[PDB]
Every structure is written in C-alpha cells, then in structure tokens.
Amino acid sequence: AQNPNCNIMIFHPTKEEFNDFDKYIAYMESQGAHRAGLAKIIPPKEWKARETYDNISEILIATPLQQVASGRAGVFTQYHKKKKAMTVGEYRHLANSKKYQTPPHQNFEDLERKYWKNRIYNSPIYGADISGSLFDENTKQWNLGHLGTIQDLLEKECGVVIEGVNTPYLYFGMWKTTFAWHTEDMDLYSINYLHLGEPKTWYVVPPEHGQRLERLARELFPGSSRGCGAFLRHKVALISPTVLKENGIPFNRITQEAGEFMVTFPYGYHAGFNHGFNCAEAINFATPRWIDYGKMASQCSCGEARVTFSMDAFVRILQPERYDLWKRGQD
Numbered sequence: 001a002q003n004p005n006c007n008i009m010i011f012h013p014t015k016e017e018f019n020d021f022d023k024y025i026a027y028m029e030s031q032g033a034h035r036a037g038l039a040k041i042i043p044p045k046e047w048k049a050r051e052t053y054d055n056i057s058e059i060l061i062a063t064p065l066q067q068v069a070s071g072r073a074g075v076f077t078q079y080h081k082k083k084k085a086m087t088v089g090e091y092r093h094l095a096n097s098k099k100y101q102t103p104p105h106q107n108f109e110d111l112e113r114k115y116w117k118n119r120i121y122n123s124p125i126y127g128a129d130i131s132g133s134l135f136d137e138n139t140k141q142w143n144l145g146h147l148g149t150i151q152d153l154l155e156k157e158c159g160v161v162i163e164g165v166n167t168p169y170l171y172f173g174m175w176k177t178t179f180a181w182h183t184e185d186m187d188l189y190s191i192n193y194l195h196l197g198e199p200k201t202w203y204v205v206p207p208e209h210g211q212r213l214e215r216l217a218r219e220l221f222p223g224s225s226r227g228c229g230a231f232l233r234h235k236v237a238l239i240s241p242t243v244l245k246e247n248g249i250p251f252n253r254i255t256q257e258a259g260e261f262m263v264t265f266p267y268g269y270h271a272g273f274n275h276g277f278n279c280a281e282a283i284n285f286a287t288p289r290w291i292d293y294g295k296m297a298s299q300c301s302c303g304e305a306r307v308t309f310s311m312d313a314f315v316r317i318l319q320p321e322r323y324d325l326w327k328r329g330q331d
C-alpha cells in the first residue's frame with residue numbers, strides 16, 4: 001500500500017508530465033498521494049500562469065466578508081459579516097494597513113503560533129468565491145478555467161447528460177483570513193493555485209480518518225451538531241492543531257507559497273489561514289475515482305449551507321433517495 005502513514009506528498013512534474021492533467025493526477029494517486037487528503041504540485045520552471053500581476057487592481061470584490069469569531073482560541077466558529085464593495089487595489093491597501101498587516105515574525109512556525117494564539121481577537125476581511133480567472137488564455141497546461149467539467153465526467157462514467165457548469169473562483173486574502181474545516185461540495189476534488197502574495201498554511205485529515213474529525217467536531221460544537229447532521233458543510237468551525245493532537249486526531253500541515261498548486265482529494269477535510277495579502281484561484285474537479293465518494297457524501301438539508309446550482313444534478317443522479325429532503329433544504 002503506497003504512503004501508508006498518509007503524509008502530504010510534494011510533486012515536481014517536468015514540462016512533458018505537465019501536459020496531461022488527468023494522467024498526472026492518476027500518477028500521484030498511484031504513489032498514494034490521496035491518502036493524505038492534500039498534495040502540493042510545483043510547476044516546471046518553464047511554466048507560468050500569466051505574464052504579470054501588474055494589471056489586477058481594478059477587479060471588484062462586490063461583497064468583502066469580515067470574519068468575526070466566537071469561542072476560545074483553539075475552538076471557535078466564525079460568521080461572515082458583509083461589507084461595502086471595494087476594488088482589489090483598495091483591498092490590497094487595506095490588507096497592508098497597520099490594523100490588518102502581518103506582524104513581525106521569525107518563520108512560518110512562529111506565525112502559526114501567533115495565528116492560533118491571537119486569531120479570535122481580530123476580524124480580518126476576505127474576498128471569497130469571486131467567479132473569474134487569472135490564467136492567461138494561452139497557458140495550455142494546468143489552466144484552471146480549461147479543465148474537464150464535472151458534468152462531462154459524470155456523463156462519461158455513468159452515461160447520463162446533466163445540466164450545469166463548473167467555473168473557477170478567485171480568493172483575495174489578508175493576514176488571519178481563515179478557511180474553516182470542511183470537505184468539498186459532494187466530496188469533490190479541488191485544485192488551488194496561489195497566484196501572488198503571501199503564503200497559505202493548510203491543515204488536512206486523511207480521508208480514511210475523516211469520521212474521527214466529524215466525531216470530535218460534534219463533541220466540540222454541540223449546539224451546531226444538534227442543528228445539522230452535516231454542520232461542517234456550513235464552513236464555520238475551527239479547531240487548532242493543539243486541540244486535534246490532544247484528541248488524537250490524525251492530521252498533517254503544509255505551507256503553500258506563490259506559484260504552487262495544491263490538490264485536495266475526495267473526503268479530505270481541510271482548514272487553514274493566509275499569512276498576508278494574497279490571491280488564489282480554485283475550482284472543483286472530478287475523476288473516475290470520485291464517483292463512489294459522491295454517492296456517499298453527506299449532505300446539509302437544514303438550510304444553512306446553500307450552494308451552487310450545479311449540485312442539484314449531482315444529488316439527483318448519485319443520491320436519489322436523499323434528493324427530495326436535500327432540495328427542501330435548498331428552498
């Protein structure tokens with residue numbers, strides 16, 4: 001069995017190996033990468049996402065979100081307060097202001113300590129889930145707006161044409177901006193490219209141990225759990241590495257830097273934070289191996305999670321028994 005300890009693997013494809021996305025994902029899996037829940041991919045030195053980042057300031061962040069925390073330093077929830085629109089140039093200046101800028105620090109581990117100690121006492125502002133792309137149209141390898149669609153994958157595997165589309169999203173972050181513990185919608189893969197700026201630290205639980213995290217989360221968030229059997233789908237709960245270690249939950253950590261891809265695998269719970277101003281692009285994708293995970297994915301039917309149009313068909317075809325209840329939660 002490859003990668004039996006479920007370590008995060010780091011890959012360095014050549015330019016030739018970077019030509020066929022599906023093949024390279026399947027290669028990484030043949031080496032056991034999926035067992036971690038997360039892998040890093042360093043592009044060949046010949047590759048670039050676009051020529052420059054000098055022309056992105058006029059992108060609009062229509063609904064910046066202030067991430068306000070409740071709880072204790074290692075175990076908290078966050079809610080997202082809506083703020084007035086601002087451009088990427090305005091947001092970059094904000095991020096670099098004395099109120100929001102990264103503090104002085106020694107190394108990534110010192111900054112991690114500061115994050116966990118202090119996050120709850122501040123409310124950083126995040127631009128999230130902005131439909132769009134920063135890949136140049138002439139980047140032909142690993143261009144996140146030209147991947148195979150999940151609807152085409154389901155049709156190829158199962159035979160049924162379905163409605164829906166699959167496009168990328170941009171994320172503009174600052175120090176302390178946080179992504180809560182979650183798996184992807186319908187336990188899909190994700191791919192994330194850090195276009196520019198400061199790093200992103202990730203935490204991940206191996207897929208084979210996902211239910212351990214779920215059981216701890218029900219214990220640590222007991223009102224939320226009573227509310228919804230799949231409340232981690234609300235994307236609001238944070239648990240620190242110290243708390244996970246105290247409770248014997250298997251996990252790993254890694255820091256992504258600008259110019260690097262991360263891939264999350266089906267049913268890999270993950271969470272993390274940004275080190276300072278940055279811009280990432282991300283999209284969900286599928287392979288043949290995902291279908292069995294999509295059929296088994298939990299679902300939020302309480303009303304909170306509210307998702308993309310295109311989840312409808314995945315539930316309808318893969319989970320027909322759950323469809324009627326799930327759809328009531330959407331309405």
Ligand SMILES: O=C(O)CNC(=O)C(=O)O
Pocket residue numbers: 171179190191192264280282283
């Ligand atoms: O960059 C982010 O905000 C986090 N993105 C993801 O969690 C992802 O790619 O799965």
Ligand SMILES: [Mg+2]
Pocket residue numbers: 055056057058059
């Ligand atoms: Mg612009």
Ligand code: NI
Pocket residue numbers: 183184190264270
């Ligand atoms: Ni994710």
Ligand SMILES: [Zn+2]
Pocket residue numbers: 227228229230231233234300301302303304305
């Ligand atoms: Zn719910």
